[PDB]
């Protein structure tokens, strides 16, 4: 699995692959690794699909209770704190989670919280999660700029996931991109690695080691 989320002048770009694997058998290649908590809050899962899916759906239900009671959006800090506390209380019970709670709030601006099985919760500007996180870091850290244009930020996320998909056995499939804006989040579609790779090779001229 590979997932990344980085803040920039235009908001947040969230990119994820689609492959899911059981052992060496590729169980599926179209797994939706982003959970849509609410129109301004976005959960990105890695690791155990069951734990992430179930507990972030539960997080969405808690978020709903929060709007019903308090008439204002659950902050990204609050949602990530609820998730972190929950995952921590099952620490050592076998949960397998890695999550980046991306969202936008009037009082917070764009914000990313990295949450995982061990109860860790990190606010930060750039995060990568999953078995292929190192390759995405290799691409992001060498190209990321705060003032990237929206098109350039989307392409950077797409390329960072593509590199990890190429070099990581458990991180193939297709690249799903989300753009968390001031007024919500925008789903910029799904890109198949089997075509994205060749398009990027021809346009950039990179991957010169790859035959053809």
């Amino acid at each position: 699995t590979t997932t990344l989320a980085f803040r920039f002048q235009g908001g947040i770009i969230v990119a994820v692959d689609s492959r899911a694997t059981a052992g060496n058998w590729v169980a599926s290649q179209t797994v939706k690794k982003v959970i849509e908590i609410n129109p301004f809050l976005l959960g990105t899962m890695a690791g155990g699909a069951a734990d992430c899916q179930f507990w972030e759906t539960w997080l969405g239900s808690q978020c709903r209770l929060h709007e019903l009671r308090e008439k204002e959006r659950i902050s990204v800090a609050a949602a990530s704190k609820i998730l972190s506390n929950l995952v921590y209380q099952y620490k050592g019970a076998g949960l397998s989670m890695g999550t980046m709670i991306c969202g936008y709030t009037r009082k917070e601006g764009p914000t990313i919280y990295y949450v995982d099985s061990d109860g860790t919760r990190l606010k930060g500007d750039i995060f990568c999660v999953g078995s292929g996180q190192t390759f995405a870091y290799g691409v992001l850290d060498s190209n990321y700029k705060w003032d990237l244009s929206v098109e350039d930020a989307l392409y950077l996320g797409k390329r960072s996931i593509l590199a990890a998909a190429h070099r990581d056995a458990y991180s193939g499939g297709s690249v799903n991109l989300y753009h968390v804006t001031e007024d919500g989040w925008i789903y910029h579609g799904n890109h198949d690695v089997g075509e994205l790779f060749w398009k990027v090779k021809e346009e950039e001229g990179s991957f010169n080691n790859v035959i053809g």
Binding site: T1, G47, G92, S96, M97, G98, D118, V129, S131, Q133
Partner: peptide, 21 residues
């Protein structure tokens, strides 16, 4: 032993590139 060596979780191999935290 169960606390000194909890033995991780079922999908730890997908979270961490080495396969180990």
């Amino acid at each position: 032993p169960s606390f000194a060596n909890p033995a991780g979780g079922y999908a730890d191999g997908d979270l961490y590139p080495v396969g180990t935290s």
